[PDB]
Amino acid sequence: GSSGSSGKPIFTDESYLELYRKQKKHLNTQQLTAFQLLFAWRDKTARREDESYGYVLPNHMMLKIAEELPKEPQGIIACCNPVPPLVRQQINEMHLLIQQAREMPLLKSEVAAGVKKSSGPSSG
């Protein structure tokens, strides 16, 4: 109102690679899929709620979730602490996204895993 041209909805960080390779353990096929789903969603709702993008969902959080890929809506609520009035309100939407990123298979990729450990002390 005071000062701000209504040019166009500039919603893009110049596809900054940093965002992708910001932290170790680069995102995999699926993880990536969800990452985009969340971003787009944030923008859509962001405008609807007449609020900024960040306010809705930050980067760190957005990632943590995309990486978790919780089949259930709870995994999305726990990711945050406390939980915002959004993620909880539109929780249903967020959940769906996670499933949309997991539903799809993992394109050819050499994976390697396998670990086993456990303990159990005692006094008596």
PDB file of all heavy atoms in Angstrom, residues 47-76:
ATOM      1  N   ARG A  47       0.172 -17.083  -0.089  1.00  0.00           N
ATOM      2  CA  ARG A  47      -0.604 -15.977  -0.637  1.00  0.00           C
ATOM      3  C   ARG A  47      -2.030 -15.990  -0.093  1.00  0.00           C
ATOM      4  O   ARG A  47      -2.561 -14.955   0.309  1.00  0.00           O
ATOM      5  CB  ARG A  47      -0.629 -16.051  -2.165  1.00  0.00           C
ATOM      6  CG  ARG A  47       0.609 -15.465  -2.824  1.00  0.00           C
ATOM      7  CD  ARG A  47       1.696 -16.515  -2.999  1.00  0.00           C
ATOM      8  NE  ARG A  47       1.248 -17.632  -3.827  1.00  0.00           N
ATOM      9  CZ  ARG A  47       1.110 -17.559  -5.147  1.00  0.00           C
ATOM     10  NH1 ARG A  47       1.382 -16.428  -5.783  1.00  0.00           N
ATOM     11  NH2 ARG A  47       0.698 -18.619  -5.831  1.00  0.00           N
ATOM     12  N   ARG A  48      -2.643 -17.169  -0.085  1.00  0.00           N
ATOM     13  CA  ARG A  48      -4.007 -17.318   0.409  1.00  0.00           C
ATOM     14  C   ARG A  48      -4.142 -16.741   1.815  1.00  0.00           C
ATOM     15  O   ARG A  48      -5.113 -16.051   2.122  1.00  0.00           O
ATOM     16  CB  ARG A  48      -4.415 -18.792   0.408  1.00  0.00           C
ATOM     17  CG  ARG A  48      -5.824 -19.034   0.920  1.00  0.00           C
ATOM     18  CD  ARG A  48      -6.858 -18.830  -0.177  1.00  0.00           C
ATOM     19  NE  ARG A  48      -7.325 -17.447  -0.239  1.00  0.00           N
ATOM     20  CZ  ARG A  48      -8.226 -16.939   0.594  1.00  0.00           C
ATOM     21  NH1 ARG A  48      -8.753 -17.694   1.548  1.00  0.00           N
ATOM     22  NH2 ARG A  48      -8.601 -15.671   0.475  1.00  0.00           N
ATOM     23  N   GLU A  49      -3.162 -17.033   2.665  1.00  0.00           N
ATOM     24  CA  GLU A  49      -3.173 -16.544   4.039  1.00  0.00           C
ATOM     25  C   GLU A  49      -2.682 -15.101   4.108  1.00  0.00           C
ATOM     26  O   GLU A  49      -2.586 -14.517   5.187  1.00  0.00           O
ATOM     27  CB  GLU A  49      -2.301 -17.433   4.927  1.00  0.00           C
ATOM     28  CG  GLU A  49      -2.960 -18.750   5.304  1.00  0.00           C
ATOM     29  CD  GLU A  49      -4.230 -18.557   6.111  1.00  0.00           C
ATOM     30  OE1 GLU A  49      -4.139 -18.057   7.250  1.00  0.00           O
ATOM     31  OE2 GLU A  49      -5.315 -18.907   5.600  1.00  0.00           O
ATOM     32  N   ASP A  50      -2.372 -14.532   2.948  1.00  0.00           N
ATOM     33  CA  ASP A  50      -1.891 -13.158   2.875  1.00  0.00           C
ATOM     34  C   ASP A  50      -0.681 -12.956   3.782  1.00  0.00           C
ATOM     35  O   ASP A  50      -0.599 -11.969   4.512  1.00  0.00           O
ATOM     36  CB  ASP A  50      -3.004 -12.183   3.266  1.00  0.00           C
ATOM     37  CG  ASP A  50      -2.690 -10.755   2.867  1.00  0.00           C
ATOM     38  OD1 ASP A  50      -2.065 -10.558   1.803  1.00  0.00           O
ATOM     39  OD2 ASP A  50      -3.069  -9.833   3.620  1.00  0.00           O
ATOM     40  N   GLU A  51       0.254 -13.900   3.731  1.00  0.00           N
ATOM     41  CA  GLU A  51       1.458 -13.825   4.551  1.00  0.00           C
ATOM     42  C   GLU A  51       2.697 -14.161   3.727  1.00  0.00           C
ATOM     43  O   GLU A  51       2.595 -14.635   2.596  1.00  0.00           O
ATOM     44  CB  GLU A  51       1.349 -14.779   5.743  1.00  0.00           C
ATOM     45  CG  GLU A  51       0.729 -14.145   6.976  1.00  0.00           C
ATOM     46  CD  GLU A  51       1.726 -13.336   7.782  1.00  0.00           C
ATOM     47  OE1 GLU A  51       2.275 -12.357   7.235  1.00  0.00           O
ATOM     48  OE2 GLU A  51       1.959 -13.683   8.959  1.00  0.00           O
ATOM     49  N   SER A  52       3.869 -13.910   4.302  1.00  0.00           N
ATOM     50  CA  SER A  52       5.129 -14.181   3.621  1.00  0.00           C
ATOM     51  C   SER A  52       5.356 -15.683   3.476  1.00  0.00           C
ATOM     52  O   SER A  52       4.690 -16.488   4.126  1.00  0.00           O
ATOM     53  CB  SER A  52       6.294 -13.549   4.386  1.00  0.00           C
ATOM     54  OG  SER A  52       6.514 -14.212   5.619  1.00  0.00           O
ATOM     55  N   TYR A  53       6.302 -16.051   2.620  1.00  0.00           N
ATOM     56  CA  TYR A  53       6.617 -17.455   2.386  1.00  0.00           C
ATOM     57  C   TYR A  53       7.285 -18.074   3.610  1.00  0.00           C
ATOM     58  O   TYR A  53       6.813 -19.074   4.150  1.00  0.00           O
ATOM     59  CB  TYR A  53       7.529 -17.600   1.166  1.00  0.00           C
ATOM     60  CG  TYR A  53       6.933 -17.038  -0.104  1.00  0.00           C
ATOM     61  CD1 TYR A  53       7.564 -16.012  -0.798  1.00  0.00           C
ATOM     62  CD2 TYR A  53       5.738 -17.535  -0.614  1.00  0.00           C
ATOM     63  CE1 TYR A  53       7.022 -15.496  -1.959  1.00  0.00           C
ATOM     64  CE2 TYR A  53       5.191 -17.025  -1.774  1.00  0.00           C
ATOM     65  CZ  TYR A  53       5.836 -16.006  -2.443  1.00  0.00           C
ATOM     66  OH  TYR A  53       5.293 -15.495  -3.601  1.00  0.00           O
ATOM     67  N   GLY A  54       8.389 -17.471   4.043  1.00  0.00           N
ATOM     68  CA  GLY A  54       9.105 -17.976   5.200  1.00  0.00           C
ATOM     69  C   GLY A  54       8.186 -18.257   6.373  1.00  0.00           C
ATOM     70  O   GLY A  54       8.153 -19.374   6.889  1.00  0.00           O
ATOM     71  N   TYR A  55       7.441 -17.241   6.796  1.00  0.00           N
ATOM     72  CA  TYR A  55       6.522 -17.383   7.917  1.00  0.00           C
ATOM     73  C   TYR A  55       5.804 -18.729   7.867  1.00  0.00           C
ATOM     74  O   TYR A  55       5.730 -19.444   8.867  1.00  0.00           O
ATOM     75  CB  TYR A  55       5.498 -16.248   7.912  1.00  0.00           C
ATOM     76  CG  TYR A  55       4.255 -16.548   8.719  1.00  0.00           C
ATOM     77  CD1 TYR A  55       4.283 -16.531  10.108  1.00  0.00           C
ATOM     78  CD2 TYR A  55       3.052 -16.850   8.091  1.00  0.00           C
ATOM     79  CE1 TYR A  55       3.150 -16.806  10.848  1.00  0.00           C
ATOM     80  CE2 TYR A  55       1.914 -17.125   8.824  1.00  0.00           C
ATOM     81  CZ  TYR A  55       1.967 -17.102  10.202  1.00  0.00           C
ATOM     82  OH  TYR A  55       0.837 -17.376  10.935  1.00  0.00           O
ATOM     83  N   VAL A  56       5.277 -19.068   6.695  1.00  0.00           N
ATOM     84  CA  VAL A  56       4.567 -20.328   6.511  1.00  0.00           C
ATOM     85  C   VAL A  56       5.450 -21.516   6.880  1.00  0.00           C
ATOM     86  O   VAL A  56       5.192 -22.214   7.860  1.00  0.00           O
ATOM     87  CB  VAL A  56       4.084 -20.493   5.057  1.00  0.00           C
ATOM     88  CG1 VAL A  56       3.442 -21.858   4.860  1.00  0.00           C
ATOM     89  CG2 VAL A  56       3.115 -19.380   4.690  1.00  0.00           C
ATOM     90  N   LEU A  57       6.493 -21.737   6.087  1.00  0.00           N
ATOM     91  CA  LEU A  57       7.416 -22.841   6.330  1.00  0.00           C
ATOM     92  C   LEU A  57       8.840 -22.456   5.939  1.00  0.00           C
ATOM     93  O   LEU A  57       9.128 -22.134   4.786  1.00  0.00           O
ATOM     94  CB  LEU A  57       6.977 -24.081   5.548  1.00  0.00           C
ATOM     95  CG  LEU A  57       7.579 -25.410   6.006  1.00  0.00           C
ATOM     96  CD1 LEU A  57       7.075 -25.774   7.394  1.00  0.00           C
ATOM     97  CD2 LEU A  57       7.252 -26.514   5.011  1.00  0.00           C
ATOM     98  N   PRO A  58       9.753 -22.492   6.920  1.00  0.00           N
ATOM     99  CA  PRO A  58      11.163 -22.153   6.702  1.00  0.00           C
ATOM    100  C   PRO A  58      11.885 -23.196   5.858  1.00  0.00           C
ATOM    101  O   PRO A  58      11.307 -24.215   5.483  1.00  0.00           O
ATOM    102  CB  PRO A  58      11.742 -22.117   8.118  1.00  0.00           C
ATOM    103  CG  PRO A  58      10.855 -23.010   8.914  1.00  0.00           C
ATOM    104  CD  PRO A  58       9.481 -22.867   8.318  1.00  0.00           C
ATOM    105  N   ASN A  59      13.155 -22.934   5.560  1.00  0.00           N
ATOM    106  CA  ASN A  59      13.957 -23.852   4.759  1.00  0.00           C
ATOM    107  C   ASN A  59      14.318 -25.099   5.558  1.00  0.00           C
ATOM    108  O   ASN A  59      13.977 -26.219   5.173  1.00  0.00           O
ATOM    109  CB  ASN A  59      15.230 -23.158   4.273  1.00  0.00           C
ATOM    110  CG  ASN A  59      14.939 -22.016   3.319  1.00  0.00           C
ATOM    111  OD1 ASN A  59      14.032 -21.215   3.550  1.00  0.00           O
ATOM    112  ND2 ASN A  59      15.708 -21.935   2.239  1.00  0.00           N
ATOM    113  N   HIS A  60      15.010 -24.900   6.676  1.00  0.00           N
ATOM    114  CA  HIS A  60      15.417 -26.009   7.531  1.00  0.00           C
ATOM    115  C   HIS A  60      14.260 -26.980   7.750  1.00  0.00           C
ATOM    116  O   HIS A  60      14.393 -28.180   7.514  1.00  0.00           O
ATOM    117  CB  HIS A  60      15.919 -25.484   8.877  1.00  0.00           C
ATOM    118  CG  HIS A  60      15.032 -24.439   9.482  1.00  0.00           C
ATOM    119  ND1 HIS A  60      13.962 -24.740  10.296  1.00  0.00           N
ATOM    120  CD2 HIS A  60      15.064 -23.089   9.387  1.00  0.00           C
ATOM    121  CE1 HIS A  60      13.371 -23.621  10.675  1.00  0.00           C
ATOM    122  NE2 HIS A  60      14.022 -22.605  10.138  1.00  0.00           N
ATOM    123  N   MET A  61      13.128 -26.451   8.202  1.00  0.00           N
ATOM    124  CA  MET A  61      11.948 -27.271   8.451  1.00  0.00           C
ATOM    125  C   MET A  61      11.509 -27.992   7.181  1.00  0.00           C
ATOM    126  O   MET A  61      11.411 -29.219   7.154  1.00  0.00           O
ATOM    127  CB  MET A  61      10.803 -26.408   8.983  1.00  0.00           C
ATOM    128  CG  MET A  61       9.627 -27.214   9.508  1.00  0.00           C
ATOM    129  SD  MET A  61       8.535 -26.243  10.565  1.00  0.00           S
ATOM    130  CE  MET A  61       9.610 -25.927  11.962  1.00  0.00           C
ATOM    131  N   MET A  62      11.245 -27.222   6.130  1.00  0.00           N
ATOM    132  CA  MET A  62      10.816 -27.788   4.856  1.00  0.00           C
ATOM    133  C   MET A  62      11.666 -29.001   4.487  1.00  0.00           C
ATOM    134  O   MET A  62      11.148 -30.016   4.020  1.00  0.00           O
ATOM    135  CB  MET A  62      10.903 -26.735   3.750  1.00  0.00           C
ATOM    136  CG  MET A  62      10.145 -27.116   2.488  1.00  0.00           C
ATOM    137  SD  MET A  62      10.882 -26.414   0.999  1.00  0.00           S
ATOM    138  CE  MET A  62      11.068 -24.702   1.488  1.00  0.00           C
ATOM    139  N   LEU A  63      12.972 -28.889   4.699  1.00  0.00           N
ATOM    140  CA  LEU A  63      13.895 -29.976   4.389  1.00  0.00           C
ATOM    141  C   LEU A  63      13.684 -31.155   5.333  1.00  0.00           C
ATOM    142  O   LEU A  63      13.360 -32.261   4.900  1.00  0.00           O
ATOM    143  CB  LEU A  63      15.341 -29.486   4.481  1.00  0.00           C
ATOM    144  CG  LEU A  63      15.862 -28.705   3.274  1.00  0.00           C
ATOM    145  CD1 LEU A  63      17.171 -28.008   3.615  1.00  0.00           C
ATOM    146  CD2 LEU A  63      16.044 -29.628   2.078  1.00  0.00           C
ATOM    147  N   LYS A  64      13.867 -30.911   6.626  1.00  0.00           N
ATOM    148  CA  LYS A  64      13.694 -31.950   7.634  1.00  0.00           C
ATOM    149  C   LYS A  64      12.509 -32.848   7.291  1.00  0.00           C
ATOM    150  O   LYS A  64      12.605 -34.073   7.371  1.00  0.00           O
ATOM    151  CB  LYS A  64      13.489 -31.322   9.014  1.00  0.00           C
ATOM    152  CG  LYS A  64      13.590 -32.318  10.157  1.00  0.00           C
ATOM    153  CD  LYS A  64      13.666 -31.617  11.503  1.00  0.00           C
ATOM    154  CE  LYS A  64      13.903 -32.606  12.633  1.00  0.00           C
ATOM    155  NZ  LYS A  64      15.190 -33.337  12.471  1.00  0.00           N
ATOM    156  N   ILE A  65      11.396 -32.231   6.910  1.00  0.00           N
ATOM    157  CA  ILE A  65      10.194 -32.976   6.553  1.00  0.00           C
ATOM    158  C   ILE A  65      10.407 -33.782   5.276  1.00  0.00           C
ATOM    159  O   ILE A  65      10.229 -34.999   5.262  1.00  0.00           O
ATOM    160  CB  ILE A  65       8.988 -32.038   6.361  1.00  0.00           C
ATOM    161  CG1 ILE A  65       8.660 -31.319   7.672  1.00  0.00           C
ATOM    162  CG2 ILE A  65       7.782 -32.822   5.865  1.00  0.00           C
ATOM    163  CD1 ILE A  65       7.893 -30.029   7.477  1.00  0.00           C
ATOM    164  N   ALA A  66      10.790 -33.094   4.205  1.00  0.00           N
ATOM    165  CA  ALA A  66      11.029 -33.745   2.924  1.00  0.00           C
ATOM    166  C   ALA A  66      11.958 -34.945   3.084  1.00  0.00           C
ATOM    167  O   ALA A  66      11.858 -35.920   2.340  1.00  0.00           O
ATOM    168  CB  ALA A  66      11.613 -32.753   1.928  1.00  0.00           C
ATOM    169  N   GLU A  67      12.859 -34.864   4.058  1.00  0.00           N
ATOM    170  CA  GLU A  67      13.805 -35.944   4.312  1.00  0.00           C
ATOM    171  C   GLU A  67      13.153 -37.059   5.126  1.00  0.00           C
ATOM    172  O   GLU A  67      13.455 -38.236   4.937  1.00  0.00           O
ATOM    173  CB  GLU A  67      15.035 -35.410   5.051  1.00  0.00           C
ATOM    174  CG  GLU A  67      15.827 -34.388   4.256  1.00  0.00           C
ATOM    175  CD  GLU A  67      17.297 -34.370   4.628  1.00  0.00           C
ATOM    176  OE1 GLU A  67      17.602 -34.310   5.837  1.00  0.00           O
ATOM    177  OE2 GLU A  67      18.142 -34.417   3.708  1.00  0.00           O
ATOM    178  N   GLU A  68      12.258 -36.676   6.032  1.00  0.00           N
ATOM    179  CA  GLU A  68      11.565 -37.643   6.874  1.00  0.00           C
ATOM    180  C   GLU A  68      10.590 -38.481   6.053  1.00  0.00           C
ATOM    181  O   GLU A  68      10.546 -39.706   6.179  1.00  0.00           O
ATOM    182  CB  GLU A  68      10.816 -36.927   8.000  1.00  0.00           C
ATOM    183  CG  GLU A  68      11.692 -36.587   9.194  1.00  0.00           C
ATOM    184  CD  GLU A  68      10.919 -36.570  10.499  1.00  0.00           C
ATOM    185  OE1 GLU A  68       9.959 -37.359  10.629  1.00  0.00           O
ATOM    186  OE2 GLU A  68      11.273 -35.769  11.388  1.00  0.00           O
ATOM    187  N   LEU A  69       9.808 -37.812   5.211  1.00  0.00           N
ATOM    188  CA  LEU A  69       8.832 -38.495   4.368  1.00  0.00           C
ATOM    189  C   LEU A  69       7.938 -39.409   5.200  1.00  0.00           C
ATOM    190  O   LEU A  69       7.775 -40.593   4.905  1.00  0.00           O
ATOM    191  CB  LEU A  69       9.543 -39.305   3.284  1.00  0.00           C
ATOM    192  CG  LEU A  69      10.419 -38.508   2.315  1.00  0.00           C
ATOM    193  CD1 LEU A  69      10.928 -39.404   1.196  1.00  0.00           C
ATOM    194  CD2 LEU A  69       9.644 -37.329   1.746  1.00  0.00           C
ATOM    195  N   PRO A  70       7.343 -38.849   6.263  1.00  0.00           N
ATOM    196  CA  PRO A  70       6.453 -39.595   7.157  1.00  0.00           C
ATOM    197  C   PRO A  70       5.133 -39.961   6.489  1.00  0.00           C
ATOM    198  O   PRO A  70       4.327 -39.089   6.162  1.00  0.00           O
ATOM    199  CB  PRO A  70       6.215 -38.621   8.314  1.00  0.00           C
ATOM    200  CG  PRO A  70       6.429 -37.271   7.723  1.00  0.00           C
ATOM    201  CD  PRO A  70       7.493 -37.442   6.673  1.00  0.00           C
ATOM    202  N   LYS A  71       4.917 -41.257   6.285  1.00  0.00           N
ATOM    203  CA  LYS A  71       3.694 -41.740   5.658  1.00  0.00           C
ATOM    204  C   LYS A  71       2.462 -41.206   6.382  1.00  0.00           C
ATOM    205  O   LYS A  71       1.392 -41.072   5.789  1.00  0.00           O
ATOM    206  CB  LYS A  71       3.670 -43.270   5.649  1.00  0.00           C
ATOM    207  CG  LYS A  71       3.336 -43.880   6.999  1.00  0.00           C
ATOM    208  CD  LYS A  71       4.592 -44.204   7.790  1.00  0.00           C
ATOM    209  CE  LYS A  71       5.078 -45.618   7.511  1.00  0.00           C
ATOM    210  NZ  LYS A  71       6.517 -45.788   7.854  1.00  0.00           N
ATOM    211  N   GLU A  72       2.623 -40.901   7.665  1.00  0.00           N
ATOM    212  CA  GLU A  72       1.523 -40.381   8.469  1.00  0.00           C
ATOM    213  C   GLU A  72       1.646 -38.870   8.649  1.00  0.00           C
ATOM    214  O   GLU A  72       2.728 -38.292   8.533  1.00  0.00           O
ATOM    215  CB  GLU A  72       1.492 -41.066   9.838  1.00  0.00           C
ATOM    216  CG  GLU A  72       0.637 -42.321   9.870  1.00  0.00           C
ATOM    217  CD  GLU A  72      -0.821 -42.026  10.165  1.00  0.00           C
ATOM    218  OE1 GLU A  72      -1.557 -41.670   9.221  1.00  0.00           O
ATOM    219  OE2 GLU A  72      -1.226 -42.150  11.340  1.00  0.00           O
ATOM    220  N   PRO A  73       0.513 -38.214   8.936  1.00  0.00           N
ATOM    221  CA  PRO A  73       0.467 -36.762   9.137  1.00  0.00           C
ATOM    222  C   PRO A  73       1.158 -36.334  10.427  1.00  0.00           C
ATOM    223  O   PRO A  73       1.550 -35.177  10.577  1.00  0.00           O
ATOM    224  CB  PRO A  73      -1.032 -36.461   9.208  1.00  0.00           C
ATOM    225  CG  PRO A  73      -1.654 -37.735   9.667  1.00  0.00           C
ATOM    226  CD  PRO A  73      -0.812 -38.838   9.088  1.00  0.00           C
ATOM    227  N   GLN A  74       1.304 -37.274  11.355  1.00  0.00           N
ATOM    228  CA  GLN A  74       1.948 -36.992  12.633  1.00  0.00           C
ATOM    229  C   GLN A  74       3.413 -36.620  12.434  1.00  0.00           C
ATOM    230  O   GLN A  74       3.916 -35.684  13.053  1.00  0.00           O
ATOM    231  CB  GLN A  74       1.837 -38.202  13.562  1.00  0.00           C
ATOM    232  CG  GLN A  74       2.269 -37.914  14.991  1.00  0.00           C
ATOM    233  CD  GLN A  74       1.649 -38.868  15.991  1.00  0.00           C
ATOM    234  OE1 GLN A  74       0.438 -39.092  15.987  1.00  0.00           O
ATOM    235  NE2 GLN A  74       2.478 -39.440  16.857  1.00  0.00           N
ATOM    236  N   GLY A  75       4.094 -37.362  11.565  1.00  0.00           N
ATOM    237  CA  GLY A  75       5.495 -37.095  11.300  1.00  0.00           C
ATOM    238  C   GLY A  75       5.743 -35.661  10.878  1.00  0.00           C
ATOM    239  O   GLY A  75       6.838 -35.130  11.069  1.00  0.00           O
ATOM    240  N   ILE A  76       4.725 -35.031  10.300  1.00  0.00           N
ATOM    241  CA  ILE A  76       4.838 -33.650   9.850  1.00  0.00           C
ATOM    242  C   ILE A  76       4.614 -32.676  11.001  1.00  0.00           C
ATOM    243  O   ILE A  76       5.168 -31.577  11.015  1.00  0.00           O
ATOM    244  CB  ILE A  76       3.831 -33.340   8.727  1.00  0.00           C
ATOM    245  CG1 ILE A  76       4.149 -34.172   7.483  1.00  0.00           C
ATOM    246  CG2 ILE A  76       3.849 -31.856   8.394  1.00  0.00           C
ATOM    247  CD1 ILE A  76       3.424 -35.500   7.444  1.00  0.00           C
TER     248      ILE A  76
END
